[PDB]
């Protein structure tokens, strides 16, 4: 396969208590079923490269990560070209094709977080194509 996709992490929340900046998230799918997500984050004056491998389950949109200990649910938003990631701490994230905030996507993301019992004060992340310490 070696199929690919590019995205922006636009907002996050959790059931508990934050990047200064983020680069785009890049996903690569591997023969076998797994996805690998990569993003770079500016935090405490430093650029952190994050990689997460999401392992296939028998259910579409549901993966395992962090040596089995995290379960991740990914689903399309009703708002065009956005997705919501839910993880269990318990966290949710809003991904979009467009770096600029969609108020509609944000609104739906709030209602999603409430259903999941997450903190309803959504953090919107600033975007930058490259990470400058």
């Amino acid at each position: 396969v070696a199929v690919s996709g590019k995205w922006y992490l636009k907002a996050m929340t959790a059931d508990q208590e934050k990047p200064d900046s983020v680069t785009p998230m890049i996903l690569k799918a591997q023969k076998g079923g797994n996805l690998e997500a990569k993003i770079t984050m500016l935090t405490n004056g430093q650029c952190q490269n994050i990689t997460v491998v999401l392992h296939k389950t028998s259910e579409p949109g549901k993966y395992t990560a962090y040596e089995g200990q995290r379960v991740v649910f990914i689903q399309p938003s009703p708002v065009r070209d956005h997705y919501i990631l839910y993880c269990e701490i318990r966290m949710a994230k809003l991904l979009g094709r467009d770096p600029e905030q969609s108020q509609e996507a944000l609104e739906d993301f709030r209602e999603f977080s409430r259903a999941k019992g997450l903190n309803q004060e959504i953090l919107e992340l600033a975007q930058s194509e490259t990470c400058s310490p």
Partner: antibody
Amino acid sequence: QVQLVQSGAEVQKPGSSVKVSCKASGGTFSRYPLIWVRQTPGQGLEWMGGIFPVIGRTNYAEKFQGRVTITADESTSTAYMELNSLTSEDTAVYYCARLDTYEILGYGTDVWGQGTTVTVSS
Amino acid sequence: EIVLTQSPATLSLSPGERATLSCRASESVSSSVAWYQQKFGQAPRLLIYDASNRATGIPARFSGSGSGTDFTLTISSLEPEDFAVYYCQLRSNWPPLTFGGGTKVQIKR
């Protein structure tokens, strides 16, 4: 592996309606767009409409709005396309297809039915 | 509505030649574009999804590119079996899923 099996070839009189079925086996449409596409002989592909679970709605192309009805029945894993007020120009091959779009990134495992020929003639 | 324009609508080439096919959306549609091959009397065959991803089994000579409004299908070097009509299509969880008008790739003489 999901398969879509359509009802067979139909002959309908001008003015009548045709209802074409599309049965899913090995899977369902609950998380995936189920769409209808036609092609008139020797001509191009035209999207007619579809069921779009992400927005909880069935939507139609302008050209067919008001003359086509698309439905599905969960219990029978079957989707349907009804085209009213047939004229000779609706003579075409009609296809259903389930689009593999649910995953943020997937393998493009779209599934098409085999096609149903509808011939409009008295 | 969103319209997909495939222009030119005919290309006349030969085995050995590169084929570059164009599909232009009437407004931005990100990466939500598929390409199909269709030969006369046969069912459409998916080549590309998400603008740049090959479907399973599709040979490497077929590549898709673009994001936004301007999409391209390139066949690096045409083989005999590649003369067909090619369609682009909006492909996504969200409507509309409009097709382009098609580009016929024929043999020049």
